[PDB]
Amino acid sequence: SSGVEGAAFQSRLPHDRMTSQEAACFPDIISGPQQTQKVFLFIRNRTLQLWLDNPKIQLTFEATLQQLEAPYNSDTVLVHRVHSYLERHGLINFGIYKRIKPLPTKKTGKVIIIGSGVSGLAAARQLQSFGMDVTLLEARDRVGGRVATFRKGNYVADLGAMVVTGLGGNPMAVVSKQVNMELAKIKQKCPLYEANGQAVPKEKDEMVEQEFNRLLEATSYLSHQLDFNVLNNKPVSLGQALEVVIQLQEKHVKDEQIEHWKKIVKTQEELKELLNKMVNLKEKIKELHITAEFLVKSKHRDLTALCKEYDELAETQGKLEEKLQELEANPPSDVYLSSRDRQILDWHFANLEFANATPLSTLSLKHWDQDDDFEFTGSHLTVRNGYSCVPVALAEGLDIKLNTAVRQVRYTASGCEVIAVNTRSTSQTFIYKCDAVLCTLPLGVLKQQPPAVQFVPPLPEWKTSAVQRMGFGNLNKVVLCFDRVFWDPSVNLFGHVGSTTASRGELFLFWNLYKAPILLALVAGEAAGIMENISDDVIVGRCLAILKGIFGSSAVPQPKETVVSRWRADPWARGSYSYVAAGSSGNDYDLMAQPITPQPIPRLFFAGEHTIRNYPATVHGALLSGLREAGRIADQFLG
Ligand SMILES: Cc1cc2c(cc1C)N(C[C@H](O)[C@H](O)[C@H](O)COP(=O)(O)OP(=O)(O)OC[C@H]1O[C@@H](n3cnc4c(N)ncnc43)[C@H](O)[C@@H]1O)C1=NC(=O)NC(=O)[C@@]1([C@@H](CC=O)c1cc(C(=O)NC3CCOCC3)cs1)N2
Ligand SMILES: [Mg+2]
Ligand SMILES: [Mg+2]
């Protein structure tokens, strides 16, 4: 059955073997008769199926046992063990669902959670359902963090996370079902328009895209086959490696051109010298002008010798003017890419800078895509009613203190205290005592200088250096709400090709949710940081000019409503999301996940998108990170 096999896959597990995490929790199983290993795997896979088939209701141990078939419904103890495991690690009974057995009246252990984004909310729900006392401290006047939906009238647009990157294996598939989140496929077709507004023809678009793919592939070869990862005692950036590959392509074009020029010059020299000898054989004919009868025959066989010598040379001439005009009619390219072509290629680079939220010259060549292996399957989807329905639903029933900005975290062998100020009256402060702190502060806030939050005692060097090495990027959006659709409704995406390499990320991509009279323009790469220093009105004006160039200056009305994100300037984010910087690696994500112990017991815990090696810079990654920490905290305090 790919019923039960599907459940494992859907939970990011192999259907047919135990994980190292399972091995640690079930040592007796992995070291015992392999027969009972299969039994374990079936129970695990089937319990997952029971949960995934109906994630709106709590799946209890009882109900699991009553739905298993003989003889598995007789493995009472093993079923309990598997159920307890799946629940603790948040593989079942996560997100938001109806409880069957209500929450324990008295609570055990106190946990403060810093930040009320998806990671914080996910962890809170887990810890609460485990019977712990949980309070979330949130600096904004709203939950959700980098999930941030603009709503006004019937305009909905996402200023933060917007895309569910495939459902196959994605825990957001469960959450989606739970909160009745309407999801829609993104059509792939993305026509590009040049700076002057003219469509890039199919032919040219496909050629350039192909070159982009070859260039990326080449850097991958250089990095992972030829091990070119360090230069002049500096780790190589992806940007740097792309520049090298491009330079080699240009050298090859120049070589082929030179070889061609040398063939032409050779042929021209041959022609010039054959003319010369044919001009001399002509002077030798001019000058050619014993019985009378034998002189005639003699000066006959003389010319026929000279003439079938010359006619012979007019033929080696013929095959040379031919070979020449074939050369000068079949040149190789004189450039690798034209000015125009390079601009279009820059569109593809801008697109990559968007995905990674940073200029390519900052990305680690070796590690930038270290998380490729863990991509989900299925089409990428958008959220029709706005992504914020997820954090809003996850907040239901939780103790969340809004407008409460944490400034100090103290942790000792005997417990912790967290100091926060009200962001509306920075006079009044609060002190919250607890057994454990879960820090979900964005990497951007952890990097902040001077610091936004003081840790007492200071975080150990192994942690701060990780914080310092890791990249934290930027990406912004301009939302344009119109009263009518003037664009093509069967297109979700279209691209604007900029005019310089440096500014390639400026308003390079426009996005529409179908029927919604809204366009989103993206600002990526070096442009992202710079354009935050421009007012909404000027940046809006620049969008309209681009759209006017494409659709006609008369087809584009003034927008009714606009919003512009400035993630870098936002004090509660300080950027958009992590990336693997040159000099960093996936190992730094693991370092970020590691709890601090002041043996004393661990007191300070870390969740957030920057703490999950396999799923960084995503909502699902934030969510999984929360589930992880909740599991570790409960293990520590509840056993
Ligand atoms: C603009 C933008 C776009 C995307 C994302 C982010 C942003 C900014 N994505 C990331 C996702 O949002 C984040 O990873 C998580 O939401 C982070 O959650 P965390 O819980 O880790 O962090 P938080 O910041 O939300 O919570 C922290 C809380 O702490 C509070 N706080 C700060 N300081 C405090 C103090 N002192 N005291 C108390 N509280 C304090 C803060 O207020 C905060 O609440 C994206 N994620 C996705 O899953 N999807 C998206 O769409 C992303 C994006 C990421 C790229 O990897 C993507 C874009 C695409 C895309 O466009 N692809 C398509 C191209 C066309 O073809 C189809 C596919 C794909 S993914 N976007
Ligand atoms: Mg190439
Ligand atoms: Mg420029």
Side-chain angles (χ1 to χ4, degrees):
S1 299
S2 29
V4 310
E5 182 175 303
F9 175 83
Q10 188 49 31
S11 306
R12 298 156 316 279
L13 298 173
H15 65 93
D16 62 356
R17 56 193 187 84
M18 297 179 65
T19 70
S20 71
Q21 180 170 245
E22 284 163 348
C25 287
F26 298 78
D28 61 310
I29 302 292
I30 193 149
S31 69
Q34 82 105 52
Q35 173 43 37
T36 63
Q37 288 168 21
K38 284 188 205 279
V39 162
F40 165 97
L41 287 168
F42 184 74
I43 292 165
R44 180 259 258 157
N45 294 341
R46 179 85 179 117
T47 306
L48 285 170
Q49 186 183 29
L50 288 173
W51 161 254
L52 288 167
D53 285 349
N54 193 358
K56 293 191 194 193
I57 312 177
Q58 175 183 12
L59 179 67
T60 61
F61 160 57
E62 179 170 294
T64 301
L65 190 72
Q66 280 182 301
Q67 289 174 102
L68 285 173
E69 44 283 290
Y72 301 97
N73 62 347
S74 284
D75 304 325
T76 305
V77 165
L78 178 52
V79 168
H80 183 271
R81 284 184 65 209
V82 169
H83 183 276
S84 294
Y85 168 84
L86 290 173
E87 183 179 64
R88 177 57 58 89
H89 294 77
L91 288 157
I92 69 183
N93 301 334
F94 71 89
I96 169 150
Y97 53 91
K98 178 136 55 63
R99 304 209 55 83
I100 286 187
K101 37 188 268 80
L103 290 164
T105 47
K106 189 210 66 163
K107 270 69 184 297
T108 319
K110 178 59 160 176
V111 174
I112 290 295
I113 296 176
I114 307 164
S116 198
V118 169
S119 66
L121 292 166
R125 292 203 76 80
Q126 291 301 100
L127 292 174
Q128 175 155 110
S129 71
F130 294 161
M132 296 192 85
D133 190 349
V134 188
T135 307
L136 288 95
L137 305 181
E138 173 57 48
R140 299 170 192 278
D141 70 332
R142 61 165 185 87
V143 296
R146 278 169 275 171
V147 180
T149 307
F150 170 76
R151 289 174 202 282
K152 181 168 274 289
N154 24 53
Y155 302 129
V156 182
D158 270 309
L159 276 305
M162 187 174 40
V163 173
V164 182
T165 52
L167 288 184
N170 189 341
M172 295 313 294
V174 159
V175 171
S176 174
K177 279 201 185 85
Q178 288 175 337
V179 306
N180 276 212
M181 188 162 51
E182 189 195 14
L183 297 176
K185 271 166 181 57
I186 307 162
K187 301 161 200 168
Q188 185 220 39
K189 188 194 162 206
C190 182
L192 300 186
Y193 300 92
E194 296 190 63
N196 60 31
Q198 283 184 343
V200 170
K202 187 179 179 278
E203 158 76 294
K204 198 153 271 295
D205 184 72
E206 281 164 354
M207 186 261 169
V208 172
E209 178 166 2
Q210 202 180 58
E211 262 310 303
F212 165 75
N213 291 332
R214 285 181 187 107
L215 285 172
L216 251 197
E217 199 284 335
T219 70
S220 183
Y221 169 80
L222 251 40
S223 181
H224 300 283
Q225 181 63 42
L226 287 194
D227 214 88
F228 163 78
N229 286 306
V230 180
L231 184 90
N232 303 350
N233 294 300
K234 296 276 83 169
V236 179
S237 72
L238 174 59
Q240 200 175 337
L242 280 163
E243 257 155 26
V244 167
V245 173
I246 287 172
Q247 274 186 283
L248 294 174
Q249 291 300 135
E250 291 170 336
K251 184 54 173 59
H252 178 84
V253 159
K254 160 161 198 177
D255 288 346
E256 281 215 358
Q257 194 176 31
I258 280 164
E259 266 175 13
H260 195 262
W261 281 338
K262 282 178 174 170
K263 285 174 194 172
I264 283 180
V265 159
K266 181 65 193 166
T267 300
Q268 284 177 340
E269 279 162 352
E270 286 172 351
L271 263 199
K272 212 202 168 204
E273 277 139 14
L274 198 73
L275 243 79
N276 186 254
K277 111 131 83 178
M278 267 176 24
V279 161
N280 285 170
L281 190 42
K282 257 283 297 287
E283 199 67 1
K284 202 188 175 185
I285 283 287
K286 173 203 280 274
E287 202 190 7
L288 226 60
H289 87 304
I290 295 158
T291 62
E293 290 173 41
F294 189 67
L295 187 81
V296 161
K297 295 285 197 209
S298 280
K299 297 251 289 211
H300 173 81
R301 99 180 50 86
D302 271 350
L303 268 77
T304 63
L306 281 194
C307 284
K308 245 153 180 138
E309 188 194 339
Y310 180 115
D311 293 336
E312 199 172 349
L313 292 175
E315 180 209 299
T316 31
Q317 184 186 217
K319 94 154 97 173
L320 252 51
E321 305 147 295
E322 206 178 325
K323 182 200 182 182
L324 169 74
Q325 208 129 322
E326 188 203 332
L327 282 166
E328 59 196 348
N330 273 16
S333 337
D334 57 321
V335 281
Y336 173 54
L337 289 172
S338 64
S339 262
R340 275 176 71 267
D341 290 342
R342 176 59 216 244
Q343 282 163 349
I344 298 157
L345 178 62
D346 271 334
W347 184 92
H348 293 276
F349 290 143
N351 192 59
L352 193 55
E353 291 179 323
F354 145 64
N356 294 278
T358 194
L360 303 183
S361 63
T362 69
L363 283 171
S364 162
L365 172 61
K366 189 173 182 174
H367 298 296
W368 72 274
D369 60 345
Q370 60 85 43
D371 57 317
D372 263 0
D373 318 61
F374 303 96
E375 280 179 357
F376 301 135
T377 69
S379 287
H380 290 198
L381 317 167
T382 52
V383 179
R384 185 137 238 100
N385 52 330
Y387 213 144
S388 68
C389 63
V390 165
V392 168
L394 289 174
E396 184 182 62
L398 291 185
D399 184 27
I400 298 160
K401 312 287 190 188
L402 297 183
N403 312 114
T404 310
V406 173
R407 299 265 88 119
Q408 188 176 124
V409 177
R410 339 172 105 271
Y411 52 106
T412 58
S414 62
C416 315
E417 297 177 0
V418 175
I419 295 83
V421 310
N422 192 266
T423 67
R424 300 275 209 249
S425 283
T426 46
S427 46
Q428 61 167 292
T429 85
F430 315 96
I431 308 170
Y432 300 88
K433 295 106 67 76
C434 53
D435 306 285
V437 177
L438 176 53
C439 177
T440 82
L441 292 168
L443 176 61
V445 169
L446 294 175
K447 282 154 103 59
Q448 201 176 294
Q449 280 297 150
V453 174
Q454 179 179 191
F455 296 89
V456 182
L459 291 177
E461 184 276 340
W462 59 261
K463 173 83 80 181
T464 51
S465 62
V467 163
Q468 286 171 342
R469 281 184 307 264
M470 299 176 68
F472 202 63
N474 197 19
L475 166 69
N476 286 304
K477 305 184 214 188
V478 180
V479 177
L480 309 158
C481 309
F482 301 97
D483 61 6
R484 102 217 62 199
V485 169
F486 59 86
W487 51 90
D488 196 326
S490 65
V491 139
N492 285 304
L493 299 170
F494 61 91
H496 157 75
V497 164
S499 21
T500 69
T501 301
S503 300
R504 61 195 181 197
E506 175 176 6
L507 302 171
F508 77 104
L509 181 75
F510 288 79
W511 202 315
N512 64 275
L513 278 41
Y514 176 70
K515 225 84 158 287
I518 294 155
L519 286 174
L520 306 190
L522 265 44
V523 184
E526 271 193 294
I530 269 134
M531 299 221 76
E532 289 198 10
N533 301 109
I534 301 163
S535 69
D536 293 13
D537 282 333
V538 177
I539 205 157
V540 169
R542 294 173 73 98
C543 290
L544 291 183
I546 285 162
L547 289 165
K548 274 172 183 174
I550 294 160
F551 293 101
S553 67
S554 72
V556 184
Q558 288 305 111
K560 286 255 83 77
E561 213 76 35
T562 63
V563 204
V564 184
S565 71
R566 291 177 175 87
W567 287 104
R568 185 65 82 191
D570 174 349
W572 314 124
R574 301 279 185 204
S576 69
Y577 40 89
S578 70
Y579 62 91
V580 188
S584 184
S585 77
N587 230 93
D588 284 350
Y589 291 101
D590 284 338
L591 253 26
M592 282 308 305
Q594 275 304 109
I596 313 287
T597 97
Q599 255 80 55
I601 218 147
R603 291 284 175 184
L604 182 50
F605 301 80
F606 292 90
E609 57 87 0
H610 59 286
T611 78
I612 185 157
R613 166 171 205 155
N614 291 351
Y615 305 103
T618 67
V619 173
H620 57 267
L623 179 101
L624 290 168
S625 85
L627 299 183
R628 182 198 62 216
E629 292 312 308
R632 154 156 49 220
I633 288 167
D635 281 352
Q636 201 66 235
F637 291 95
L638 304 190

